[PDB]
Amino acid sequence: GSRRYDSRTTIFSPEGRLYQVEYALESISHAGTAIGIMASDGIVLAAERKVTSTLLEQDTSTEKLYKLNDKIAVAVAGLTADAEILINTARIHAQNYLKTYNEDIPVEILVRRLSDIKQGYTQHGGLRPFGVSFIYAGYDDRYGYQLYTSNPSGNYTGWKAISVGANTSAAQTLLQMDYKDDMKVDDAIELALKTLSKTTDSSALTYDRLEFATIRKDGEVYQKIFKPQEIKDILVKTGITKK
Amino acid sequence: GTGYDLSNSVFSPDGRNFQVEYAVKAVENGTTSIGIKCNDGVVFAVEKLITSKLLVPQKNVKIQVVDRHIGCVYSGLIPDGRHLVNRGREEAASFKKLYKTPIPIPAFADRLGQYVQAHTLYNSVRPFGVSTIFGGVDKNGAHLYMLEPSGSYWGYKGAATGKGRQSAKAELEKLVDHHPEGLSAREAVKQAAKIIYLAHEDNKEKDFELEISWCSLSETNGLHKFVKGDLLQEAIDFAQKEIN
Amino acid sequence: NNYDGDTVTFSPTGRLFQVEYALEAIKQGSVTVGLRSNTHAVLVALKRNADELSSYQKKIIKCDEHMGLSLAGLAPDARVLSNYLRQQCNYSSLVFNRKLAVERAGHLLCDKAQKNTQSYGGRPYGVGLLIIGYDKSGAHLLEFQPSGNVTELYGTAIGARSQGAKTYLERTLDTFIKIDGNPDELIKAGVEAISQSLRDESLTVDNLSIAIVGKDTPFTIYDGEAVAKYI
Amino acid sequence: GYDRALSIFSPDGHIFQVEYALEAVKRGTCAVGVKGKNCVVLGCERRSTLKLQDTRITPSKVSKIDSHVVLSFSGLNADSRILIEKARVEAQSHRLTLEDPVTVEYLTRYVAGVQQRYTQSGGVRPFGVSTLIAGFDPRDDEPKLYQTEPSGIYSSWSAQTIGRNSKTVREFLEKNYDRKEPPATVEECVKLTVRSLLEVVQTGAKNIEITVVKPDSDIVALSSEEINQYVTQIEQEKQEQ
Amino acid sequence: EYDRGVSTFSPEGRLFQVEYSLEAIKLGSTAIGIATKEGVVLGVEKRATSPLLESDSIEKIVEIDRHIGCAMSGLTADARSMIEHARTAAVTHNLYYDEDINVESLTQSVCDLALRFGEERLMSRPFGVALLIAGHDADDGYQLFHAEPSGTFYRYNAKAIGSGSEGAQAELLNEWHSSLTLKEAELLVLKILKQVMEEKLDENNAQLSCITKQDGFKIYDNEKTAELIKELKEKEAAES
Amino acid sequence: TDRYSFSLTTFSPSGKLGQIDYALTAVKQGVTSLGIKATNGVVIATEKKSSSPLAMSETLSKVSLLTPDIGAVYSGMGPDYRVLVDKSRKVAHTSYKRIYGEYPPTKLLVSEVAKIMQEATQSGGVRPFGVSLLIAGHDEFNGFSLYQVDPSGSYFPWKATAIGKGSVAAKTFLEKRWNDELELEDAIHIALLTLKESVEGEFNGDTIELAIIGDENPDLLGYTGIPTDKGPRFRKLTSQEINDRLEAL
Amino acid sequence: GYDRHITIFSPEGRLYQVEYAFKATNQTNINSLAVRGKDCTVVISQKKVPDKLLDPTTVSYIFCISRTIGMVVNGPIPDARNAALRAKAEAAEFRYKYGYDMPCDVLAKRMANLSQIYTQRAYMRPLGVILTFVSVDEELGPSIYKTDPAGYYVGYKATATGPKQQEITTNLENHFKKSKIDHINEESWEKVVEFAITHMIDALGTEFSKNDLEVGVATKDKFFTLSAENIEERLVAIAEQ
Amino acid sequence: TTTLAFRFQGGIIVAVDSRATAGNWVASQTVKKVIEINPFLLGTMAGGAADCQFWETWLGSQCRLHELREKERISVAAASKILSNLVYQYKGAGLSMGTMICGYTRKEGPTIYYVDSDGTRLKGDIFCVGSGQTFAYGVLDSNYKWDLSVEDALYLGKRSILAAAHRDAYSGGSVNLYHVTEDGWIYHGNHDVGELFWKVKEEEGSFNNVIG
Ligand SMILES: CCCC(=O)N[C@@H](CO)C(=O)N[C@@H](CC(C)C)C(=O)C(CO)CO
Ligand SMILES: [Mg+2]
């Protein structure tokens, strides 16, 4: 029958490793770098666009940063289409939680739901996993500001600062060097921009090659996706470009 | 590359489905079976290889009937032939239920052909290991058809399949060439007995039992009946006289 | 050999190797013989034992008061097939108040077995069945193979070394065909036939099973001391 | 739809997918469980890459199945999440239908049955997870410690470890656990557990989790400072022997 | 080889997965059964993998019903599904018929479940466990059945399964007679277990149980088994 | 039966999704098609490569309307594109117009077709689509937009781009010829000039297909009497208009 | 390897099964052509009856799909009849659901969509047939639309299919370059049948008897197939040309 | 029907009648309305005869399965809840049953649970179910006290079922008596009303509404 063509995507290697999970992580390793930093009063997400050209529109472009609800956002590294599938499911689950409990979904619950969705593909169904890694930046009343990551294995972890995609080792070393616990959100913006500029593969770091977002505080939490002009302003403000 | 013949419904670089051709190989290794369309009907005949004398004679019937007017004989995997005949019986039943009239021979042929051809579209199923000679009398007269494991079927003045298919075919052609006006029903019965006896020579090591049925507009009133009794013995004697 | 992976693959010769391997599973099974006259039909079964502490496995299965079978091969597949045959006889009796003809039972088994030789996933049944029955047409004996081919015979044998009993019945045909109205002589002929298929054994009370069906005799199975008179 | 038999037999009588799941368990964090006279202690190893990791929000290795029964694991953490969810749902269902919380053995048998089912179903791979389930049966002060493997086997243990370098910890436990005298005090049991972890944990504390289980739904996870106290006691007594 | 189906015949006429599962059963703990006229006896090697393992939690002999017990050997995790099926079969037969289920019928139901594998959903592989089903009913008295993942089952006066089954079968064949008593059967089971065991046989790594028409199916506690072991030692010491 | 219930697109050890790369390869061998966004409209163009001169070119329409304000062109395997445009037209109604009464924005329809393609790269027993699409649309709150959708399901917004054989050369041309002050007529002119390099044979209205998303066409509405019903912005250029704009190069 | 057996992409972006189905279309060694008249559409095909045991009247590759649509198939007769039955079903369902006769091009698009499905889903093999639909559509006039195993479909001013396809194609191209129109400027369908037979005899270089041809004519609100006697009339009238 | 069960110092007393009626027709006078689920578990029957008999036999099957799986006697709470969830699955379908699960376990002591086809499940010390529950309730409540002797409690249950059998037309036949102690249940005989009435009238001096 068809059993000869079945690649068996949900089997174990003799070492106890999932072939497809490892290969999808290797795939994500070539994706644009994304960084999340959790300050004491905010969270910062930054990412570099792998797709670059003079003719690419940036105003209407959303490739790496996505809104899940009004208090949680994601930085994406990997297959953007699998990412959009998972983001749609996550938005639906957040709105389900809202309809059921009349409260915004706690960040870890949403992250765990999305990680369970990811893990399902690695145990049954005989389908390929999602070639996407996520950095979730969120806020809830129970734990405050939260930063999580999720890889195709379905495993998820919580971080003060973290990076996914290309040059994760260099970015993680730089963050471990320059991260302090009591820092504010603006210092985190500066640190994220510095790490992206030091780990980029391009000549210089411009506004057109990166996406930026901040979840900060009026007693309320505001989620800001940075526009190209705001990105250019913050770049010239942190001393990475001039005018 | 290679491996094109390992799965069904796989096109080879020359555009062939090797599994169907292997099914045809399975067909050719079967016993001889023929059909002769005469002036007002059709006659079907088959050789039954009597492997031992422990076989109860006149039992173990091979000729099958669909509805009351269709006769079917097949060479190859006997169980695949029975399966195909069961499907054809379901088709004829549904056709009668919806349209009241018994299913015409071309309509029934297309039912069988679509079924067999569908069995060559997927790797999850094996093609039919039979070739089938069938037919009968409808409102448009007598019809004889032969259907291949590929799903290909055609209308024939005469048809033959199995081991002795070559000799049989030749004999059939002689008939078509000698009297183009046609044979009568009983004449066709005796001639089918002759052709089965002649085609048995390719299996002359083991003894055989002749089996003949017919569907004639005048001799059987359009119904399918086994040729038995005095007429069967008459055909057997005609065959004995024609071989010697 | 790349053509023996499943039942949906024809070999270039036109063969179905999984069906052939099921037949070979039969040939490794214990010997059982069946024969019939014009009024009766007998199954004799040499049931095999795993060892001397083992039980000689049940080898004859009743399907209805007028029909039964003996098996050679994979006992589970014979259980499945015998249950199907029981259900078909039961359906005949319930819906039509009609004892199922033995020929029709053979046809139904043929179709049930053929369904497994053409579909991916699953296998042909690894059993051969000898089916005896008395119906409105008299006595009947049928041989059933996993290929689906069912054939009506006066006598036959299946299992290991079955050719001895086969040739014995081929020679004794005109003798046992005329044992009408004397079940003991028919059973003795069947036991001599099954004895012709022994190499380093001899029939005893533990390894013998007999089954009889006939004109005024419903399908009955004799096991143990009941068969001692035929040894 | 997808029902292909992934876990099948090999000619030597092995189900390679289950053994590879055991392999995945062998590369997971170490987990140890020790039965006291009136408590069960579960210790767990954290990885040393905790640089920048947020310990407040990161999932802990010891998950509470019910007020009286807790579960730790070794292997793939996502499979563990699936198993833990199934176990918690079954515990609430047992409360609902029997009007009595699950026994540690019943919960263990349910988890092991799920794992076994996964080695027998088509289209699915086994769990790369082995579990230690600890607690006290309702209205009982006898400790219970059970272990389940990806194959579906489960068994009771006076003390047991699974995961990476668990053979060293197992040798230490076989040497230093007396059936005649189990650790009487909670302190003695926690001390034995942190010693068992330190045999393989080359970082010391902060890379050690400890959860104590006492009867009648008393469950407490030790803070890093209490673990540091125990570790300093172990280091002081290390020179003695 | 994954390049074939689970329901695939070998050229010799055997099911690959069935034979391989039998090979897996050969690797399991030893389980021996002896059927007498005073009852049936089932013994198993517990086989602890570490001194820390509490040997009491090794349930390799289970109760199907008050008159039917079971001993498992091989991948004992696979046994659970069969044990629940058999317990449900016995209780359901008692519900439908107000009587105890015949031992052969219970074994047949288990084996009907056994070959329900392949690729309308079934299990993917055969069981990796073999069963000794001991019981008593009024029709055939005391019975001991051996149930394989092949769907086939046999009846035995005595039968040994698992690791070291060959020599155990030989010993049983030599030492079994029809007039064997229950205690004699217990001692013989303990003897063969001690012979094929890789450790010194004691009450902690060997479990004994029996089925009597009077008292049903009872698993011997540690003390009775220890006394039987001491009595076997005394019996063996009184030989020349 | 359908035994193909498993993914036919898996990760290689290098991390590549082989079938997606091979579908992109199949796209690269497709006829050149380009799109250019202006300030008052968008233009999409392609070459009408007919195999036989006996074939009628008008039936082989490579530019397809999706909504009255959104059109599409492709490079790759024609039939995949045809079934994709059918699915897109259907989903524009089922998932949006029947819910909100208005046609969907360009980005949302693009994401729906991207979801279809991503399903094709992950569902059981199916190959990815062998096409890349250029979707040119206009909505009230985003203005004019031009998106490119790949077999992987990835989509990106372009000021101007090209796909197919002459993709690299055409894109270089567009990069050195495009500015944010461009007009719809200037964009049509640049599109014609860019196609002139990617078409070696005859270059007339009969051999090229060109369409625009510009202003609303009340004459193409079919009815009058609803002041809010402005008309369709998608308009396919006729061969005569193409010739009139070619004669003045 | 296996990318040559199912409809998936080769590293060169090719579907080898589709190409091999295209190859299978020429298995019957029969050529056919289709031409458009003033108000009709003619299809001629070769009629090869090799066996003397065959009923020639049942040997056909032209199908009456609807009362207005005719279909000639280049390929094996099992796949031909499969596609023909599917087309008849689709045309009847169209007339029922939408209240007007299915247009030729719409049926072509339907069959082409099914072919595309076969080339994208792996469980179903492509049909090794090339389908030529002819009609006199109420909105388009004489129409010829062709569909191939690849899922491609297109209309033609005239067309030809088979092994000697290119020769007939060249002849027709030359005639239409000379004639400067896209059809046959003849009023009667008999004259268009004559034209088609003449140009096939010229392109193939072989004469035809009445038993060597199959002629299907589509006129307004009718599609029929000529008998051997009607074809003999056409040939006899050709003799004077 | 009239069934009653009450717990006191000495354990549990269970007392039922034995009459089954199909309308005004007395279908039977010898119906066993106590199911002996196990040596420590009894179940009373009141309502549809088929419903009660069938579902309590099924409950006994479920309790046997529980013993086989958990190697432990099922609790009274668990058995009552099994039956309760079963009948609630059929709520509205037309099941008519009113049962009392009475038992002793080492965990919860002696326990009486009332279950009905409505899905109601109640734990209690005294219960009377059936068409004649009010009649038995009168006598039982008027003569109940916790510190009753086993003899006195047996006689109180017998007398309450007798009073119900007297006044209620649909109750009668024979009183079936059971005593549940820590060691399990003990049957205390089938007492025909046709003689017990006159015996109690003579010895007790009650039933002065009757001629005799
Ligand atoms: C012939 C069968 C017809 C039947 O089922 N009658 C029922 C209800 O009319 C019935 O006999 N119920 C008894 C209970 C016993 C029989 C278990 C009862 O509960 C009281 C009234 O509640 C007696 O009337
Ligand atoms: Mg295909």
Q: Which residues contact B59 (CB under 8 A, 6 or more apart)?
A: C103, C152
- Of ligand 1's atoms, which has the minimum distance to the CA of residue H130? 22
Determine the Cα–Cα distance for residues E222 and E206; give it in Å rounded to an integer.
Answer: 9
Identify which of H152, E147, F7, G237 has the alpha carbon closest to the alpha carbon of residue C55.
Answer: E147
Cα C219 from chain centre: 14
Burial class of residue F60 in the structure, from the number of CB atoms within 10 Å of its CB (0-12 exposed, 13-18 middle, 19+ buried):
middle
How far, CA to CA in Å, does E105 sit from each of E68, E133, E140, E153, H111? 11, 11, 12, 11, 38
Asked if chain C contacts chain H via 3 or more Cβ pairs within 8 Å, the reply is no
Measured between its terminal Cα atoms, the distance across chain G in Å is 56
Tokens of C85: 């045959």
Cα B161 from chain centre: 7
**Residue that has been written with the tokens 């599938």 in this structure:** A85
Determine the Cα–Cα distance for residues G114 and G153; give it in Å rounded to an integer.
Answer: 11
Report whether residue H164 contacts ligand 1, using a CB cutoff of 6 Å: no
Query: Residue A13: its chain D contacts at CB < 8 A?
Result: 20
DSSP SS3 for D114: helix
Tokens of F177: 């010829």
Measured in Å, residue A1 CA sits from the centre of ligand 2 at 13
| C-beta of residue A174 within 8 angstroms of C-beta of residue A195 | yes
Tokens of B185: 């029903």
Residues B151, G78: C-beta atoms closer than 8 Å: yes
Measured in Å, residue H37 CA sits from the centre of ligand 1 at 20
Query: Residue C119: its chain F contacts at CB < 8 A?
Result: 1
Report whether residue H45 contacts ligand 1, using a CB cutoff of 6 Å: yes
Residues G116, F80: C-beta atoms closer than 8 Å: yes
DSSP SS3 for F197: helix
> Considering Cα of A49, then A63, then F142, then F186, what sign does the dihedral take?
positive
Partner G contacted by F171 (CB < 8 A): no
Determine the Cα–Cα distance for residues E87 and F52; give it in Å rounded to an integer.
Answer: 75
Alpha helices in chain B (DSSP H): 18-28, 78-99, 105-118, 165-178, 185-199, 230-243
Q: Which residues contact E112 (CB under 8 A, 6 or more apart)?
A: C79, E151
Identify which of D107, D111, D120 has the alpha carbon closest to the alpha carbon of residue E81.
Answer: D120
| C-beta of residue H99 within 8 angstroms of C-beta of residue H115 | yes
Determine the Cα–Cα distance for residues G148 and G163; give it in Å rounded to an integer.
Answer: 15
Angle between helices C183-195 and C162-171 (to 10 degrees): 130
- CATH number of the domain within which C170 lies: 3.60.20.10
Look up residue B104 and give its DSSP letter: P
Residue of H21, H95, H170 best suited for mutating to test ligand 1, as the one with most atoms within 8 Å of CB: H21
Residues A26, F11: C-beta atoms closer than 8 Å: yes
Number of H helices, E strands in chain H: 5, 12
| C-beta of residue D74 within 8 angstroms of C-beta of residue D25 | yes
- Of ligand 1's atoms, which has the minimum distance to the CA of residue H20? 11
Which H or E run includes H181? strand H174-181
Q: Residue with the nearest Cα to atom 12 of ligand 1?
A: H47
Q: How many CB atoms lie within 10 A of CB H93?
A: 8
The region, left, alpha or beta by phi > 0 then psi within -120 to 50, assigned to residue F101 is left
Report whether residue H139 contacts ligand 1, using a CB cutoff of 6 Å: no
Look up residue F93 and give its DSSP letter: I
Preceding residues of all breaks in chain G (C to N beyond 2.5 angstroms)?
A: none
Domain spans of chain F, in order of start: 1-248
Determine the Cα–Cα distance for residues A172 and E122; give it in Å rounded to an integer.
Answer: 48
> Considering Cα of F212, then F218, then F219, then F220, what sign does the dihedral take?
positive
Domain around G38: 1-241
- CATH number of the domain within which G138 lies: 3.60.20.10
Report whether residue H47 contacts ligand 1, using a CB cutoff of 6 Å: yes
Q: Which residues contact D99 (CB under 8 A, 6 or more apart)?
A: H75, H77, H78, H81
Domain around A57: 1-241
Residues G13, F127: C-beta atoms closer than 8 Å: no
User: What values do phi and psi take at B11, rounded to 5?
Assistant: -80, 130
Nearest CA in chain B to F2: B124
- CATH number of the domain within which H180 lies: 3.60.20.10
G216 DSSP β-pair partners:
G43, G225
* Count, residues in chain E: 240
Measured in Å, residue H29 CA sits from the centre of ligand 1 at 11
Starting at the edge strand found earlier in the chain, the sheet holding B224-226 runs B158-161, B33-37, B41-50, B207-216, B224-226
Q: Residue with the nearest Cα to atom 11 of ligand 1?
A: H20
DSSP SS3 for H49: helix
| C-beta of residue C139 within 8 angstroms of C-beta of residue C35 | no
Residues A4, E3: C-beta atoms closer than 8 Å: yes
Tokens of C122: 């699953």
Minimal C-alpha gap between E164 and chain D (Å)? 16
Determine the Cα–Cα distance for residues E171 and C51; give it in Å rounded to an integer.
Answer: 13
Query: Residue E3: its chain C contacts at CB < 8 A?
Result: 5
B207 DSSP β-pair partners:
B50
| C-beta of residue B199 within 8 angstroms of C-beta of residue B208 | no
Determine the Cα–Cα distance for residues E89 and A189; give it in Å rounded to an integer.
Answer: 68
User: What values do phi and psi take at C77, rounded to 5?
Assistant: -65, -35
D35 DSSP β-pair partners:
D40
Burial class of residue G175 in the structure, from the number of CB atoms within 10 Å of its CB (0-12 exposed, 13-18 middle, 19+ buried):
middle
**Residue that has been written with the tokens 């909100």 in this structure:** F100
Burial class of residue A109 in the structure, from the number of CB atoms within 10 Å of its CB (0-12 exposed, 13-18 middle, 19+ buried):
middle
Minimal C-alpha gap between C145 and chain A (Å)? 25
Look up residue F32 and give its DSSP letter: P
A134 DSSP β-pair partners:
A76, A150
Residues G123, A4: C-beta atoms closer than 8 Å: no
Report whether residue H148 contacts ligand 1, using a CB cutoff of 6 Å: no
| C-beta of residue F20 within 8 angstroms of C-beta of residue G139 | no
| C-beta of residue F239 within 8 angstroms of C-beta of residue F204 | yes
| C-beta of residue C103 within 8 angstroms of C-beta of residue C140 | yes
**Residue that has been written with the tokens 């800001």 in this structure:** A224
Domain spans of chain B, in order of start: 1-244
Q: Which residues of H are annotated as a binding site for bortezomib?
A: 49
Determine the Cα–Cα distance for residues C4 and C2; give it in Å rounded to an integer.
Answer: 6
**Residue that has been written with the tokens 């799909």 in this structure:** G65
Which H or E run includes E68? strand E68-74
E180 DSSP β-pair partners:
none
Note the CATH number of domain F1-248: 3.60.20.10
Q: Which residues contact F15 (CB under 8 A, 6 or more apart)?
A: A23, A24, A26, A27, A28, A29, A30
Determine the Cα–Cα distance for residues D153 and D95; give it in Å rounded to an integer.
Answer: 25
Residues E25, D8: C-beta atoms closer than 8 Å: no
Which H or E run includes B212? strand B207-216
- CATH number of the domain within which D85 lies: 3.60.20.10
Which H or E run includes F235? strand F234-236
Asked if chain A contacts chain D via 3 or more Cβ pairs within 8 Å, the reply is yes
Look up residue E123 and give its DSSP letter: B
Q: Which CATH class is domain E3-239?
A: alpha beta
Query: Residue E84: its chain H contacts at CB < 8 A?
Result: 69
Domain around C101: 1-231
Identify which of B113, B114, B118, B112 has the alpha carbon closest to the alpha carbon of residue B9.
Answer: B118
Determine the Cα–Cα distance for residues B19 and A1; give it in Å rounded to an integer.
Answer: 13
Minimal C-alpha gap between F2 and chain C (Å)? 11
Protein residues with C-beta less than 5 angstroms from the ion ligand 2: G 7, 124
Q: Which CATH superfamily is domain B1-244 in?
A: Aminohydrolase, N-terminal nucleophile (Ntn) domain (3.60.20.10)
Angle between helices B165-178 and B185-199 (to 10 degrees): 150
Q: Considering only the C-alpha atoms of chain B, give the largest distance between any 2 of them, rounded to a whole number of Å.
A: 60
Rounded (10°) CA dihedral C79, C85, C91, C96: -160
What single-letter amino acid sits at A113?
R
Q: How many domains does chain C have?
A: 1
Q: How many domains does chain D have?
A: 1
SS3 of chain E: helix, strand, coil, percent, to 5:
35, 25, 35
Determine the Cα–Cα distance for residues A205 and A212; give it in Å rounded to an integer.
Answer: 13
Starting at the edge strand found earlier in the chain, the sheet holding C60-64 runs C60-64, C67-73, C127-135, C138-144, C150-153
Identify which of C16, D1, F220 has the alpha carbon closest to the alpha carbon of residue B22.
Answer: C16
Alpha helices in chain D (DSSP H): 16-26, 77-98, 104-118, 166-176, 186-198, 224-238
Tokens of G197: 């037979």
Domain around H193: 1-212
DSSP string, B113-147: HHHHHHTTS-TTBPPP-EEEEEEEEETTEEEEEEE
| C-beta of residue F47 within 8 angstroms of C-beta of residue F208 | yes
Cα F236 from chain centre: 12
Asked if chain G contacts chain C via 3 or more Cβ pairs within 8 Å, the reply is no
The region, left, alpha or beta by phi > 0 then psi within -120 to 50, assigned to residue G159 is beta
Query: Residue E150: its chain C contacts at CB < 8 A?
Result: 74, 76
Which H or E run includes E31? strand E31-35
Alpha helices in F144-213 (DSSP H): 167-177, 184-198
DSSP string, G93-124: HHHHHHSSPPPHHHHHHHHHHHHHHHHHBSSS
Determine the Cα–Cα distance for residues F125 and F9; give it in Å rounded to an integer.
Answer: 9
Identify which of B88, B10, B33, B12 has the alpha carbon closest to the alpha carbon of residue B208.
Answer: B33
Number of H helices, E strands in chain A: 6, 10
Minimal C-alpha gap between F7 and chain D (Å)? 10
What single-letter amino acid sits at D103?
T
The region, left, alpha or beta by phi > 0 then psi within -120 to 50, assigned to residue G220 is beta
Measured in Å, residue F84 CA sits from the centre of ligand 2 at 18
Determine the Cα–Cα distance for residues C96 and C93; give it in Å rounded to an integer.
Answer: 6
Starting at the edge strand found earlier in the chain, the sheet holding E31-35 runs E158-161, E31-35, E40-45, E206-212, E216-219
Q: How many CB atoms lie within 10 A of CB A18?
A: 25
Starting at the edge strand found earlier in the chain, the sheet holding G62-64 runs G62-64, G69-74, G130-137, G141-147, G153-156
User: What values do phi and psi take at C205, rounded to 5?
Assistant: -75, -30
Tokens of F53: 């001169």
A3 DSSP β-pair partners:
none
Q: Which residues contact G236 (CB under 8 A, 6 or more apart)?
A: none
Q: Residue with the nearest Cα to atom 15 of ligand 1?
A: H49
Residues A1, B124: C-beta atoms closer than 8 Å: yes
Determine the Cα–Cα distance for residues F136 and G210; give it in Å rounded to an integer.
Answer: 56
Angle between helices E103-114 and E76-97 (to 10 degrees): 130
| C-beta of residue B54 within 8 angstroms of C-beta of residue C155 | yes
Identify which of F75, F57, F45, F32 has the alpha carbon closest to the alpha carbon of residue F206.
Answer: F57
Q: How many CB atoms lie within 10 A of CB H188?
A: 18
Q: How many CB atoms lie within 10 A of CB C75?
A: 23
Nearest CA in chain G to F25: G13
Determine the Cα–Cα distance for residues F205 and F207; give it in Å rounded to an integer.
Answer: 6
3-state helix/strand/coil string of G37-57 = CCCEEEEEEECCCCCCCECHH
Starting at the edge strand found earlier in the chain, the sheet holding B141-147 runs B64-66, B70-76, B130-138, B141-147, B153-155
Identify which of E162, E223, E129, E139 has the alpha carbon closest to the alpha carbon of residue E33.
Answer: E162
Which H or E run includes H70? helix H49-70
Minimal C-alpha gap between B95 and chain A (Å)? 33
Nearest CA in chain B to C7: B126
